[PDB]
Ligand binder design. Sequence first.
Ligand code: NA
Ligand code: NA
Ligand SMILES: [Zn+2]
Ligand SMILES: [Zn+2]
Ligand SMILES: [Zn+2]
Ligand SMILES: [Zn+2]
Length: 279
Amino acid sequence: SKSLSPMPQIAGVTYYGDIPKQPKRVVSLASTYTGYLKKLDMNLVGVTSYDKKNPILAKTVKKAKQVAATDLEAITTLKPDLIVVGSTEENIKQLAEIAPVISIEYRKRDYLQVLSDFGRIFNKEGKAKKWLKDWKTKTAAYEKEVKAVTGDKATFTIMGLYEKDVYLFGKDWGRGGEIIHQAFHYDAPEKVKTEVFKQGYLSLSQEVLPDYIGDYVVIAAEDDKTGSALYESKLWQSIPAVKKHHVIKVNANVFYFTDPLSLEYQLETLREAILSSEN
Ligand code: NA
Ligand code: NA
Ligand SMILES: [Zn+2]
Ligand SMILES: [Zn+2]
Ligand SMILES: [Zn+2]
Ligand SMILES: [Zn+2]
């Protein structure tokens, strides 16, 4: 049998079976966590659709098979020694019959803590610690670069377009919020803090958008055409941030994510976009 993880008790983490310390064949069914596993040099043999559509992650998991959580046959045939899932998956019992499962409840641990937590689970403390130390220094330095342009008290709002809907996001639901609000310590407008931050996201009707945007808005979308009717509208064009050219449009296929690999890309992209806003 496998050498075992110490299986520390951590908020949001549930273990089904004896988790290996050094898994050799991991199936990641929670796109939130795939890039954490890759940062810790895990061999991923299965990943999901969102992972394959994230160009930053995809380059690192070319040999992994795309699977869904319902793919019991394909997952079995991949011969995993570990499956990682989100807590809202509904067939965890069946997955746990294939291999040991780590189930993670989103948001119980923050985007940085999740990495050090995996460091404890897999005895990869050194790799996690080095990444986190560098991240702390780099983000502080980049915070200074961007605030030199915007001022330190500029407000930012995180937004996403999905289907025909409009979402606002807080500091810990992806779409750049970890970068903007946690790493760069930008404030959000009061209405966003009051109405969005606690839930993490808020589906909004388009006509109230001006009320939630201050100095800057970051907008995630999967394709560049979705926002067209909004962007040309008198409503949108009336927003001061839009008039000032303080709109930063980002690609959701990577900006949905919160993992170290995706966030490295988001960090450089957002740094450059803020600097570029004053060209
Ligand atoms: Na998840
Ligand atoms: Na302001
Ligand atoms: Zn045992
Ligand atoms: Zn259900
Ligand atoms: Zn809708
Ligand atoms: Zn203009």
